[PDB]
Design a protein around this ligand. Sequence first.
Ligand SMILES: CC(=O)N[C@H]1[C@H]([C@H](O)[C@H](O)CO)O[C@@](O)(C(=O)O)C[C@@H]1O
Ligand SMILES: CC(=O)N[C@H]1[C@H]([C@H](O)[C@H](O)CO)O[C@@](O)(C(=O)O)C[C@@H]1O
Ligand SMILES: CC(=O)N[C@H]1[C@H]([C@H](O)[C@H](O)CO)O[C@@](O)(C(=O)O)C[C@@H]1O
Ligand SMILES: [Ca+2]
Length: 401
Amino acid sequence: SVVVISQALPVPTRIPGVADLVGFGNGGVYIIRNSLLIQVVKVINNFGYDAGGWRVEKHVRLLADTTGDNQSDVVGFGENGVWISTNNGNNTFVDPPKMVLANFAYAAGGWRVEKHIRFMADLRKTGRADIVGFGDGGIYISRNNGGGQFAPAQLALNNFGYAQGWRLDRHLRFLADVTGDGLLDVVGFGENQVYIARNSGNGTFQPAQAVVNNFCIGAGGWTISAHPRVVADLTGDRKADILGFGVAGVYTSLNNGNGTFGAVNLVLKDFGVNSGWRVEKHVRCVSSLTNKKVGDIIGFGDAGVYVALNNGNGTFGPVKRVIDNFGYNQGWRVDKHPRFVVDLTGDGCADIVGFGENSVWACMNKGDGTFGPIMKLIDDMTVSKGWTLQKTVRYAANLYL
Ligand SMILES: CC(=O)N[C@H]1[C@H]([C@H](O)[C@H](O)CO)O[C@@](O)(C(=O)O)C[C@@H]1O
Ligand SMILES: CC(=O)N[C@H]1[C@H]([C@H](O)[C@H](O)CO)O[C@@](O)(C(=O)O)C[C@@H]1O
Ligand SMILES: CC(=O)N[C@H]1[C@H]([C@H](O)[C@H](O)CO)O[C@@](O)(C(=O)O)C[C@@H]1O
Ligand SMILES: [Ca+2]
């Protein structure tokens, strides 16, 4: 697959890759490096609930390469600005973090987790992540000029902001390449249309264009509470398509290749409301599970994990239950046990990792979208070791390649 940044998954992971696990726990930052030694290493005495007073409801914590060396850094949008702990290359990070910009923060700019979105993204092909925020006035960017130097925030576009009516309980915003030039464009599921704003590569986005009159709360009755939507390449040309988990099942609108979109089609009669899928019980993902390197469908359902494989053109094979685990029936809960679909083995076919009640578990893809047995990774970064959704943040992330 390709680099798409979403609200649900603001830290993209590489296909192929051997993703690491990163936890912002009470006591600070801990990593599990993907390797022959599986252990938890504490790396930063900060960015934690107790270590610095970091709060899920006030602050944002991400990973991103802010230097251009393909190593991920820790990035926190704190009370009064943006703090970065850079990767030292050896499973250590700079501590204390450095405050790079007095903006995009609770008390510097009036940023609110419940109103605004903050990402890091290399928006100008410099190799380094710029700060990008969907704020009040529109989209703001702080340019990453290297050496830890971030420029004062500049308005990238006067759209997709709270002022323009954008709401986290109604609407969705993504960064994804819809043209194939490698620049991440805005894709926004608004009140009545899906819009794109083309990335000009210079810290600005072009005027919004409506591309589809569906997939929205006011067009087709798509709600945040029942009908998740994603953007992902379903054909293998590196250009992002639209995919929605609706009522009858999965609908898509395919990119024509130039960032305009096709008609909306029902392509699979599963993974929707009518087949019993529920945002409160289940996790629904699109990731590459095969050597076709396109978006396949993965659902963590009741009885286990279900998969429908993309034929390579956005049509799908039959739904198969591939693992009898990680499901609601096995006690896995959306509010307690983070589950990710990411490559942990370097073959290009995404695997499964789940932060369970007692242990972190993984289940590896055989290379063809079928899976091996469940494997216990470590007894840490779990509910029973004091990690909750309300006080901790957990990601899969490529710290290195
Ligand atoms: C959340 C958010 O967007 N904050 C931004 C605000 C709002 O757009 C305006 O306060 C809307 O009135 O504008 C700034 O120029 C500012 O005043 O500091 C930049 C800041 O980062
Ligand atoms: C959330 C959302 O879709 N906002 C869009 C709105 C709404 O469609 C109107 O509020 C409907 O009346 O219209 C705009 O032209 C605007 O206000 O600049 C574009 C903006 O992106
Ligand atoms: C969420 C969802 O599945 N929406 C689907 C809707 C709704 O079923 C009806 O609009 C509700 O009355 O039906 C469509 O034909 C439409 O109107 O666009 C396709 C769309 O994908
Ligand atoms: Ca794999």
